C-alpha cells in the first residue's frame, strides 16, 4: 500500500509513490524506510507506524516502481514469495540508491520535517542502506541483515556519517556474512557500528517470519531507536 497522490521524481524522471506517515508532533526528523524484497507491504506499514509512535515521520518509497509499481507482496504466500525473488533478482541496485536519494531529498523538505533525515532498511533495503551511507545522503543510516554487504567492503572508507548494521550470525535462506571479514572491514571506520545476533539469521525482525527471534528483534530495535534519537529536536 502507498499513500495515494504521493509522487517522488528521481534522477532520470522516473517517478514513484511512497507510503508516508506524518509525525505525531511537528517538527520531526524523517526516516526513509528502504524496503525488503516484498515491496511496500504490511511489514513496511508496521515499520512506518512504529517510527511514528517513536517520534519520527516516515517515508517508505516504492523501489519496485521501475519494474512493477505498487508491488506489495505477502511473505506468507508462496507464489508471492516467488514473485519477490524474481523482482529482487532483476532489481537495479544503483537505480535503487538513486531513488532512495530522491526520497531523502523529498523527506528533508516536507512541512513536518525538522531538517534531519535518517534511513532504515531491511535486507535488500539493508544493503541499500550501506550504499546510501557510502554516498553520504543521510544523517544516519541503519541496515538490518543487509544482503551482500561483504562484497561491498571496499566502500567502508567512503562512509562519512553514522551507519549501524544488525547482522544475523546464522545462515537461514540467505547465508550469514563472514563475522571475521565484516568485523575487520567495518572496524577501520568508527562511523560504522555493527552488532551480531548469534541466535538469528536474516529476517529476524518480522513477527510472522519463520526467522523471527524476539530477543534479536527487540535488542536491534532498541539500538536502532537509540541510534536515531539524536536526530530528534
Residues acting as catalytic residues: 171, 202
- Helices (H), ranges, the chain: 42-53, 78-89, 93-108, 124-135, 179-187, 214-228
CA distance 169 to 191: 22
Show the cell assigned to 199: 541466535
Show the cell assigned to 217: 528483534
Length of the chain, please? 233
CA distance 142 to 83: 26
CA distance 131 to 78: 30
Displacement of CA 66 from its chain's centroid (Å)? 18
Using DSSP, state whether 96 is helix, strand or coil.
helix
Nearest to 165 by CA among 176, 173, 84: 176
Give the count of beta carbons closer than 10 Å to the beta carbon of residue 221. 17
Strands 57-61 and 28-34: parallel
215 close to 127: Cβ distance less than 8 angstroms:
no
Amino acid at each position: 500500500m502507498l499513500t495515494e497522490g504521493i509522487s517522488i521524481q528521481s534522477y532520470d524522471g522516473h517517478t514513484f509513490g511512497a507510503l508516508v506517515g506524518s509525525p505525531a508532533k511537528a517538527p520531526a526528523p524523517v526516516i526513509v524506510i528502504a524496503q525488503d524484497i516484498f515491496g511496500v507491504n504490511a511489514f513496511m506499514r508496521e515499520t512506518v507506524s512504529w517510527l511514528v509512535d517513536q517520534g519520527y515521520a516516515a517515508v517508505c518509497p516504492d523501489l519496485y516502481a521501475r519494474q512493477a509499481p505498487g508491488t506489495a507482496l505477502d511473505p506468507q504466500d508462496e507464489r508471492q514469495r516467488e514473485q519477490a525473488y524474481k523482482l529482487w533478482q532483476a532489481f537495479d541496485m544503483e537505480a535503487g540508491v538513486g531513488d532512495l536519494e530522491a526520497a531523502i531529498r523529498y523527506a528533508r523538505h516536507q512541512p513536518y520535517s525538522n531538517g534531519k533525515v535518517g534511513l532504515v532498511g531491511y535486507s535488500l533495503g539493508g544493503a541499500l542502506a550501506f550504499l546510501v551511507a557510502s554516498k553520504g545522503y543521510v544523517d544516519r543510516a541503519v541496515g538490518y541483515y543487509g544482503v551482500g554487504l561483504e562484497k561491498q567492503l571496499n566502500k567502508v572508507p567512503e562512509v562519512k556519517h553514522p551507519a549501524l548494521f544488525h547482522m544475523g550470525g546464522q545462515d537461514h535462506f540467505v547465508p550469514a556474512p563472514s563475522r571475521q571479514l565484516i568485523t575487520e572491514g567495518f572496524g577501520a571506520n568508527p562511523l560504522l557500528q555493527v552488532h551480531w545476533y548469534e541466535e538469528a539469521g536474516h529476517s529476524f525482525a518480522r513477527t510472522g517470519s519463520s526467522g523471527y527471534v524476539a530477543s534479536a528483534a527487540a535488542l536491534a530495535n532498541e539500538r536502532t531507536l537509540d541510534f536515531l534519537v539524536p536526530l530528534q529536536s
